[PDB]
Amino acid sequence: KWDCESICSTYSNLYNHPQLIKY
Amino acid sequence: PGAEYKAKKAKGDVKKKGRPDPYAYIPLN
Amino acid sequence: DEEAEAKMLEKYKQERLEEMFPDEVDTPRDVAARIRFQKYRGLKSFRTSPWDPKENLPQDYARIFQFQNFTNTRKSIFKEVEEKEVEGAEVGWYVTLHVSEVPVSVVECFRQGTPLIAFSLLPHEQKMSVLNMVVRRDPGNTEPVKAKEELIFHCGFRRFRASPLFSQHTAADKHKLQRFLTADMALVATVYAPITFPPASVLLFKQKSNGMHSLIATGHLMSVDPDRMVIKRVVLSGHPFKIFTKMAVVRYMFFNREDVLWFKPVELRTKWGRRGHIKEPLGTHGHMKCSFDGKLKSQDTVLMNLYKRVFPKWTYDPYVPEPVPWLKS
Amino acid sequence: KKKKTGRAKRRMQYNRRFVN
Amino acid sequence: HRPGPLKQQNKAHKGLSRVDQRHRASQLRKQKKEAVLAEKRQLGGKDGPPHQVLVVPLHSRISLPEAMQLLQGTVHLNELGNTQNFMLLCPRLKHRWFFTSARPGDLHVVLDMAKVADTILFLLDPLEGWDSTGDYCLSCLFAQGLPTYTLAVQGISGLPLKKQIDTRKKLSKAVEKRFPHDKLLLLDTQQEAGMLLRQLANQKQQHLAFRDRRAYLFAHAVDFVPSEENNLVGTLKISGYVRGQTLNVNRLLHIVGYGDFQMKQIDAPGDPFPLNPKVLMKADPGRQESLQAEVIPDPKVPKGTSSYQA
RNA sequence: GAAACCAAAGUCUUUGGGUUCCGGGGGGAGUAUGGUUGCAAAGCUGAAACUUAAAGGAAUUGACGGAAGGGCACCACCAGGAGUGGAGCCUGCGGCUUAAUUUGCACCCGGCCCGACACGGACAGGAUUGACAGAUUGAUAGCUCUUUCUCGAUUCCGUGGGUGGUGGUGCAUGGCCGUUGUUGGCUGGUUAAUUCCGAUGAACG
RNA sequence: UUAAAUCCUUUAACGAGGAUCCAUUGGAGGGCAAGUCUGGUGCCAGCAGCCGCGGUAAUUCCAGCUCCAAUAGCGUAUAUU
Numbered sequence: 001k002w003d004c005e006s007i008c009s010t011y012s013n014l015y016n017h018p019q020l021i022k023y
Numbered sequence: 024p025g026a027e028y029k030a031k032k033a034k035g036d037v038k039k040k041g042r043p044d045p046y047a048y049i050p051l052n
Numbered sequence: 053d054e055e056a057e058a059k060m061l062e063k064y065k066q067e068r069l070e071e072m073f074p075d076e077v078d079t080p081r082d083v084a085a086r087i088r089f090q091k092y093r094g095l096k097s098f099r100t101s102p103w104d105p106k107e108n109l110p111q112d113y114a115r116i117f118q119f120q121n122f123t124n125t126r127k128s129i130f131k132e133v134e135e136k137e138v139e140g141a142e143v144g145w146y147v148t149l150h151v152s153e154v155p156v157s158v159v160e161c162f163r164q165g166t167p168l169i170a171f172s173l174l175p176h177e178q179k180m181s182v183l184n185m186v187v188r189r190d191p192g193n194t195e196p197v198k199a200k201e202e203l204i205f206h207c208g209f210r211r212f213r214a215s216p217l218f219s220q221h222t223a224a225d226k227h228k229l230q231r232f233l234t235a236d237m238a239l240v241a242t243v244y245a246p247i248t249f250p251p252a253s254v255l256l257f258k259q260k261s262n263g264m265h266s267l268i269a270t271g272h273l274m275s276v277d278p279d280r281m282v283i284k285r286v287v288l289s290g291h292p293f294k295i296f297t298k299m300a301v302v303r304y305m306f307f308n309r310e311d312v313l314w315f316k317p318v319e320l321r322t323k324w325g326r327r328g329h330i331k332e333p334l335g336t337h338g339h340m341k342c343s344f345d346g347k348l349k350s351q352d353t354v355l356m357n358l359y360k361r362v363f364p365k366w367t368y369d370p371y372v373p374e375p376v377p378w379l380k381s
Numbered sequence: 382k383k384k385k386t387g388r389a390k391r392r393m394q395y396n397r398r399f400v401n
Numbered sequence: 402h403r404p405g406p407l408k409q410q411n412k413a414h415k416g417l418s419r420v421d422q423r424h425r426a427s428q429l430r431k432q433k434k435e436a437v438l439a440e441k442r443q444l445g446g447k448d449g450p451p452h453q454v455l456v457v458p459l460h461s462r463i464s465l466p467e468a469m470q471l472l473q474g475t476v477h478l479n480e481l482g483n484t485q486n487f488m489l490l491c492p493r494l495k496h497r498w499f500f501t502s503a504r505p506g507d508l509h510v511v512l513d514m515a516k517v518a519d520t521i522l523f524l525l526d527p528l529e530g531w532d533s534t535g536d537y538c539l540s541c542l543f544a545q546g547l548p549t550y551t552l553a554v555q556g557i558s559g560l561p562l563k564k565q566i567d568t569r570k571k572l573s574k575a576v577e578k579r580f581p582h583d584k585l586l587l588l589d590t591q592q593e594a595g596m597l598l599r600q601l602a603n604q605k606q607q608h609l610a611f612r613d614r615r616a617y618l619f620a621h622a623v624d625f626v627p628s629e630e631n632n633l634v635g636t637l638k639i640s641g642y643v644r645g646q647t648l649n650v651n652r653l654l655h656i657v658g659y660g661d662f663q664m665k666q667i668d669a670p671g672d673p674f675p676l677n678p679k680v681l682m683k684a685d686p687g688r689q690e691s692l693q694a695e696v697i698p699d700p701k702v703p704k705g706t707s708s709y710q711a
Numbered sequence: 712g713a714a715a716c717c718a719a720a721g722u723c724u725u726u727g728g729g730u731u732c733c734g735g736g737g738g739g740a741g742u743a744u745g746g747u748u749g750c751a752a753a754g755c756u757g758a759a760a761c762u763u764a765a766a767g768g769a770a771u772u773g774a775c776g777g778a779a780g781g782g783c784a785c786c787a788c789c790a791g792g793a794g795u796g797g798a799g800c801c802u803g804c805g806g807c808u809u810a811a812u813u814u815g816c817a818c819c820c821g822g823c824c825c826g827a828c829a830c831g832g833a834c835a836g837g838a839u840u841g842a843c844a845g846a847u848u849g850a851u852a853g854c855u856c857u858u859u860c861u862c863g864a865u866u867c868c869g870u871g872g873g874u875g876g877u878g879g880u881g882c883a884u885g886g887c888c889g890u891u892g893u894u895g896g897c898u899g900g901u902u903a904a905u906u907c908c909g910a911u912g913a914a915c916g
Numbered sequence: 917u918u919a920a921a922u923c924c925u926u927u928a929a930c931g932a933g934g935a936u937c938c939a940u941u942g943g944a945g946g947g948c949a950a951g952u953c954u955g956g957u958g959c960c961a962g963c964a965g966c967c968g969c970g971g972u973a974a975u976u977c978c979a980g981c982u983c984c985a986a987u988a989g990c991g992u993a994u995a996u997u
Contacts, residue, residue, distance in 0.1 A: 004093050005317045008107070016109035018118040018278055019697045021176060023125060033805040072872075115696050133614060133646065140649040140683060141669055144449045146642050149618075150666035151654060154637035158659055159625045164482040167501070167513050168623060170639060170656050172616035172648040178661050180695045190540065206545065208611055209516060209657055211509075246661075246695060251610045253545050257508075265508055267537065270544035293817065301817070309810090325958075325972025335818060336810060370660050377506035378537050383938050386987090402775045415767090563922075764966090 024049065056261075060195075067196040067232050075231060076287045076355075085311040092286055092358035094318025099224040103361070105279055112366045113278060116244065117179045122276060126249050129174060171209050176247055180368070182278035183207065183245040185254040186221055187271030189235040197258065197268060199231050200365055204265060204372055207245065207273060208252030213369035216241035216256070217362065219282045229284040229362055233269065240274060244366050247276050263376040281361050288356040290320075298344050300328070302354055306338035320356045322348055444519070444606065447676045450642035451488060451499040453619065454601060455518035457511060457542075458504065459535030460526040463555055465502055468524060471594045472500055477674050479621065488674050489598075496602045497676050505538035513657055515542055516612065517619045517644070520549045520601055525585065527556040527568055530575040539579065549607045552580060553597060558589045616648040621673075636665070650683050651690040661693055 025047035030037040036045045080088055091108075095101040119125055141147045149170075162168045185207065197203070199218045204211065218230040219240045230239050241256065256269035290305030306312045312333035319329045320342070328344035342354075385393055404410065417425070445452035456472070458465050474491040489498035501518070503511045515521060521542070525531070531539065554572065557565055573585065586600065587593050618641045627635030653661045668681040702711060 003314055003317055008093055011104075011107045013104055013106035013109075016111065016114045018109075018113050018116045018181075019699070020118045020120055021125070023121050023128075030805050033803095035805060037805060038807095068872095117697070130614065138647055138649050140647045141643055141667055142647040143643055143645070145669050146621075146640065146672045147618075147648075147667060147669050148638055148640040149654070149664050150668075151637050151639065151662050152665045153634050154625070154662060155659065156625065156627065156633045156635075158637065158656065159623060161658070162481075162620065162623050165484045167510060168620040168639070168656065169513050169517050170618045170620065170654050171612070171645075172618075172652055172654050173661075174615055175652055175691060178653050178691065178693055178695055192537070192540065206512065209615075209617075209655065211657060249614075253611070255541065255544050267540055267544075270540070296815085322972090334811085336820085337818090339818075372658070375508045377504070378508065378534055379506060380533055382934070383936085386939055390987095402777095403773095405772085566922085 063196050063198065066198075070232050071234070074287065075229075075285050076289055079288060079305070079307065081307060084308060085306055086314045089286065089315075089358055092360045094315070094357060095226075095359050096319060098228075098357075098359075099222075099226060103226055103281060103283075103359075105225075105281055108361070110363050112244065112363060115180065115366075116278060117176075117181045117247065118278060119276065125176075129176075129249065133174070169209075174249055177249065179247055180244060181247050181276055182280070182364070183243055183248065183273065184275045184277065184280055185216075185241045185243075185271055186238050186274045187233075187241055187254060187256055187269035188238050189233055189269055190267045191235065193258075193266050193268055194235065195258075195266075197233050199229065199233075202367055202369075203268065204257040204259060205243070205245070206253070206255035206257070208248040208254075210246065210248065211372045212245065213367070213372055214243045214245060215365045215367040216243045217282055217364040218242075219280075226281050226283050226359075229282055238271070241269070241271075242280060242282055243364050244368050248273055249276075250274070259373070263373070264378050265375050282363075283359050284362045286358040286360070288358070290354040290356070292348070292350065292352070292354065295347055295350060298328075298347055299331075299341060300344060300348065300354070301334060301339060301341050303339050305354070305356070306340070308338055309333050309336040312338060312340045315356070315358075318356075318358075320354055322352050322354050324348065324352045326352070328354075440606075445496050445498075445602070447495070449497075450644050451497040451674075452520065452601070453499045453501065453518045454520045454522055455511075455514050456500060456502040456522045456524065457515075457538065458524040459531035459538070460524070460529065461532055461534070462526055463524045465504070465524070468553075468555060468588055469500065469502055471588055471591065472598070490674065490676060491598070491602075492676065494599065494602060495676065497674070498598075498601075505532070506534045508541065509658070511538055512541060512545055514619075515545060515548075516609075516657075517617060518548060519606070520551065520604070521547065522597075522601075523550060523552045524588075525552055525554045525572065525576065527554055527560065527572060530572065530579075546609050546611070547607065548609060549604055550583075551586065551597070551601060551604070552576070552583055553586045553588045555588050557587050612645050614646070616646045617644050618642065618648075619644070640670070650685055653691055653693065661695075663690075663693065 025036070025045065027042075028036055028039065028045040028047070038045060079085055095103070158168065185205075200215050202213055202215050204213055205216075218233050219227040219242060220230060221227075221238050221240050227240065233239055241254075250273045252273040254269075254271045254273055255267065256271075257265040258268050259265055288305060290302040292300040292302055294301055306315070312330065316330050319327065321327050322344075326344050326346050326348045328342050330340055330342045333340045384390065443449060456465070456469065458468075469485075469487075472489075473487055474489050474493070476487050476489055478485055478487040484502065486499065486501040489500060491498075501514050503514055505511060554569075557569065560568060569585075576583075576585070586597050588597065618639070620639050621641040623640070624638045625635060626638070627633070629635070648667070650664050650667060654664050655661050665685065666681065667683050668679060670679060
C-alpha cells in the first residue's frame with residue numbers, strides 16, 4: 001500500500017554520521 | 024465558505040480523504 | 053582498438069542524446085517501475101521543496117570528516133597563522149629535515165633529475181572529506197567525459213586520481229546532476245579527497261592511451277563540505293491519446309497498473325508549460341487518466357520528474373603515473 | 382560567401398535601394 | 402473610484418589648510434613607501450632565500466643550454482642526472498639567484514617547479530610565438546597560477562636588420578593575444594643578460610595566495626638511510642631553504658607525488674652559498690602533533706478457485 | 712494666458728521706462744553644524760553625504776461595488792391547496808469499488824492483419840508467394856504451431872532527429888446538376904379485374 | 917635617400933578567382949535606421965542610458981539566418997561644450 005511519499009517516512013536520518021570537527 | 028468541498032460537476036457536498044468531513048468555519052468579530 | 057572506437061561512438065551518441073533531451077529515459081518493459089525507480093522521489097518545487105540532508109547517508113560518509121562551521125574554522129586558522137607566531141625555523145634558513153617513514157623510490161626520483169618539492173601543511177588537511185571544485189572545460193579538448201569516470205586532479209600542491217561527480221553551480225540547497233561535462237559553463241566536481249583550505253587552483257586531466265595527459269578542466273576549489281546535496285534527475289515521458297476539457301489519457305508512460313498507483317502522489321508537467329497530476333489509472337496496461345490546468349494540444353508530451361540524491365564514489369588513488377612529454381595529437 | 386567591402390558595398394546598396 | 406465635484410476635495414496648502422593637506426599626503430606616502438620597501442627587501446637579499454627563476458622555453462627551436470650559458474657574479478652549479486640548476490651570486494647588485502629550467506610538455510616537472518618558483522622566464526621564438534606544446538604548458542601555468550613572469554626572445558641577431566625590426570613587430574603582434582601589455586627582452590650578448598638580470602631583480606612580485614599560507618621547501622640535496630632495508634623505508638634527509646612561513650614539527654609534511662609524512666627532526670646547518678662571505682630547537686611529542694589518521698579510527702482455498710472467486 | 716481667468720496677470724521671440732527682494736526636479740530639510748538675538752520658548756542666517764523618475768498645476772468628464780424613485784412577475788411574496796424533503800422501489804449527477812463500471816465502447820481481457828531515402832548484411836547456393844494434413848486457440852486459421860510441395864527477383868533484416876506519405880487540414884481553381892405557359896400523341900408465367908410482375912413520340916407562344 | 921642607414925619615391929624578377937591575399941564594431945519594440953523569422957530558457961538566466969521586455973504563442977534574454985549604421989575603424993567610462 002506504499003507509494004512514493006509514504007516510503008520516505010521510513011528513512012532514518014541518524015545512522016551514518018561523519019565525524020564532526022567542532023569550533 | 025466551503026469552496027474546497029463544493030463539487031464542480033454536481034450540486035452537493037463532496038468528501039475529501041486528506042481532510043475530515045465537509046464543513047466551513049468562519050470567525051466572529 | 054576497434055572496441056575503443058565503438059565505445060567512443062557510444063559515448064558521443066549518449067552526449068548527443070543528453071544534449072538534445074536533458075535526462076529523459078526509456079522505461080524498462082520487463083523490470084517494474086516500482087522496483088527500478090524505488091529510491092526515486094518526486095519534488096514539487098525542486099529548489100523550494102524540502103529535502104532532508106541526512107536521509108540515507110551511505111557507508112562512505114561514515115569514513116569522512118565534517119566541519120560544523122567551515123568559514124569560521126578557516127578564518128580562525130588563517131588569523132592564527134597570520135598573527136600568532138609558532139616557534140620553528142623561519143623564512144630564509146637553509147634547513148635539513150629528517151622525516152621518518154619515507155619509501156626508497158623517492159630518492160631514485162631525485163637522482164635521475166626530477167624535482168622534489170615538500171610543503172608543510174595546515175592543521176586538519178590530512179583527513180579525508182568531500183571537496184567541491186568549480187571547473188570550466190578547456191576549449192582545447194572536446195572529447196566527452198561521463199559523470200563518474202576517473203580523472204587526475206591537481207588540487208593545491210596535491211595530485212591524485214579520483215572519480216568526480218558533476219553538478220550544477222547554483223546557490224540553492226539542491227543541485228541537479230550533470231551527466232556530461234559540457235564546454236560552455238561552470239560546473240562543480242564533488243569528490244572524496246583530503247581537506248584543502250581555499251584558495252587553491254584545480255586542474256582536471258584525463259589520461260590518454262599513450263601516457264599523455266590531456267587538460268580537461270580548469271578551475272578553483274570552492275568548498276569542503278559533505279552537506280552539499282547532488283541530485284540526479286530522471287524524466288519520464290508520456291503520450292496522450294485524446295483530449296477532453298482539462299482531462300487527458302496518457303499512454304506509453306507506465307506499463308502496469310501498480311506502477312501508476314506507485315508514482316501517483318507527485319505532480320507532472322508538460323513540454324509546453326501545462327501542469328497536472330494523475331487522477332486515476334484507467335487500464336491495467338499502464339494507461340491512465342490525469343487532469344490538467346488547461347486543455348493541451350495533441351502534439352504535446354507530458355513529463356515526470358524523479359529525484360534521487362547521488363553520492364560520489366570512493367576512488368581515491370594518491371598515485372598518479374608519470375607522463376610522457378605532451379605533443380601533437 | 383564573402384561580403385563586398387569598401388566602395389563595392391556602397392555600390393551594391395545604391396543599386397538595391399535606388400536603381401530597381 | 403474617482404469622486405466627482407459633489408464630494409468635497411479641499412485644496413491643499415503649499416507651505417583643512419593646504420599645509421595640513423600636504424602633510425597628510427606626505428604621511429600616507431611615507432607609510433606606503435615604507436611598507437613597499439620592507440616587502441621588496443624581504444626577497445632574495447642577504448636575509449632571504451634565493452630568488453628562484455624557472456626558465457621555460459616555449460618552442461622546440463629554443464636552444465636552452467645557450468640561454469642558460471648566457472645567464473651565468475659567482476656561479477655554483479648543482480647537477481642532477483640529466484638537468485642542471487645553478488645558484489648565481491651578484492655582490493655588485495647584492496642579489497642571489499637560483500636558476501632552474503624545464504622543457505615544456507613534461508607536465509609534472511614544469512608544474513612542480515612552477516608552484517615553487519618566484520619568477521618565470523618564458524623564452525620565445527623570433528619567428529613564431531610558441532609551439533602547441535608551449536601553448537599546453539601556458540594553459541597549465543595560467544590555470545595553476547602565474548608568479549612574476551618575464552618574456553625573452555633568443556634569436557633576433559641571426560636575421561638581417563630590416564627583418565629584425567619587422568619580425569620584432571610581428572612577434573609582438575602574435576604574442577599580444579596572451580600577454581597583452583608585456584615588454585619583450587633580448588638574449589643575445591652578455592650585456593643583454595645583465596639587463597635581463599637587473600630587470601628580474603627589481604620587479605613587482607605577483608603573490609600566489611596558496612603557498613603564502615603554508616610552509617614549503619624546494620629540495621637542494623636529499624639523502625636516505627633505511628631503518629629496515631627489506632622494509633624499504635627509512636629516514637629521509639631533505640635540505641633546502643624555507644620559503645613561505647615558519648614550519649613546525651607538530652604539523653605534517655606533504656611531498657607532492659608521495660603524500661603525507663611525519664617529520665622527526667629539523668636542524669639548521671650552515672648556509673652553503675651565503676651572499677656576503679646542527680642547531681635544532683624543537684620538541685617532537687604528540688601532545689598536539691597531528692597524526693596520519695585520514696580515515697576515522699572508529700568503525701480454505703479449493704484447487705480450482707481463481708483470484709476473483711477467491 | 713497651460714487654463715481657471717485677468718482691464719491687468721495687457722502694451723512679450725514685433726522680446727530694453729526705473730528699481731528692490733527672490734526661484735532653479737522631488738526628498739534629506741529649514742535638518743545638522745557654525746554665527747547672532749532672546750530670561751526661556753525660540754526667532755534670523757543655513758548645508759552636505761545620500762536618495763529618487765518623477766513631484767506638481769489647470770479645468771473636463773467616463774467607467775466605478777454601488778445609492779434614491781418606479782414598473783412587472785405564483786420559475787417573487789400574502790391567504791391557502793397539493794406536495795417533495797420521512798420509509799421502500801427504481802433513475803441522474805457526485806463520491807466509492809473494480810478490468811471497465813464508455814460518454815458529456817477510447818479502453819478491460821485476449822486473438823488477428825499489415826511507407827519510402829541512404830548505408831551495412833542475406834539474396835538465385837536461391838531472396839520470396841501460394842499450402843495437403845494434424846493441432847495451438849476461448850473456437851479456426853498456413854494470419855498461428857510441426858512435415859516439406861510449389862511461384863520464383865515480383866527481393867527482406869537493421870540503423871539515422873536527414874527527407875518523409877491511400878497522409879490529415881485551410882486558400883485560389885476549369886466544367887456540370889438543380890437553384891435563383893399552351894396544344895397534341897405482348898413470347899412468359901399470375902389474379903376476381905385491360906389484375907401482378909416480366910421485354911417493350913411531337914409542335915406553338 | 918642619409919653623417920651611415922631605415923622609410924618614402926624610381927625601377928628589374930616573382931606575386932590574385934572561394935582573386936581563403938576571407939573588415940570589423942555596435943545594434944534590429946520606441947526614441948533611432950534596421951525581423952512581430954526559427955530553435956532554447958520560462959519574472960529564471962538575463963537585457964535595458966530612459967520608457968520598458970522576460971511569470972509556456974519573448975518583435976527586446978542566449979543563439980542560427982537575415983537586415984541596419986559607421987567603416988580601418990567602432991563601442992564603453994569620465995571631464996567638458
